[PDB]
Amino acid sequence: QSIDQLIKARGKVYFGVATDQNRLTTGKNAAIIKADFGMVWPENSMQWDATEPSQGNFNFAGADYLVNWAQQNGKLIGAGCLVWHNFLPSWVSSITDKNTLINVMKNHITTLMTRYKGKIRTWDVVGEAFNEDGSLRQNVFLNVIGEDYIPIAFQTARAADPNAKLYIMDYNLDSASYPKTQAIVNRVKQWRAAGVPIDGIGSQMHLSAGQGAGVLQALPLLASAGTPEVSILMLDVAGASPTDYVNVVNACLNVQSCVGITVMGVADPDSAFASSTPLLFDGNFNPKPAYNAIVQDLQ
């Protein structure tokens, strides 16, 4: 049974997965994505180090492969991350002039979003912008541009492709009492009050065992910021307990504005955390107990 087909029948948009060319051409990834998933994100091929390895000079081959495969197979596309501290080339990190970094960041956003204009359902525009205490993370953008970098990124993105849903995403938003969870909500409210076009908050749910239960309180807290959408991103759970995975899926079902769920990969050996067996398919590409538990929960 297809978890994407089932979640759509419950009124959600998709069950998605991160992938890229050389997963699509190996294992049983393409077959499983075709049957069971409704949306794909490039895991790496849209990040800054992959797409703009030197200033103004873009590399599209990998991202084009993913986008084309998705279109050929009738899948929605999410992509990102346009602005975050991960996967950031040293040429960007070196920049000290505010105007220069604003131009660099806007060129990066506009070039990527223009190439794929109208093809991308969801763009993760800003990622990992918060410290664990809820203050803004002192990455190169904050240090050089200041906190306006976030409004500028979103306004630039909206102009480049008005059709895309624009998200901010972060991790450790899994507990409703944690300061980071509270802070992203409070700041997204403020930005949206200033007219900043933040359509979504995405929660990067890289979970430890037993953390599914807390998401039942954290996800509605995230939704209280008033964005039209929220999403679950990068989902994996150490041990892949059915209870953890079902709690996450039910949090999605409970939150009206939660459009869907993206898992970090298909099969355990292809996880960055393979020892923790944290995905829904095993190393022979067979569905695990958590996959079947989600099926039953959604039926």
Ligand SMILES: O=[N+]([O-])c1ccc2nn[nH]c2c1
């Ligand atoms: O949900 N995802 O797995 C995922 C993976 C990589 C990303 N880059 N930007 N947004 C992403 C979402």
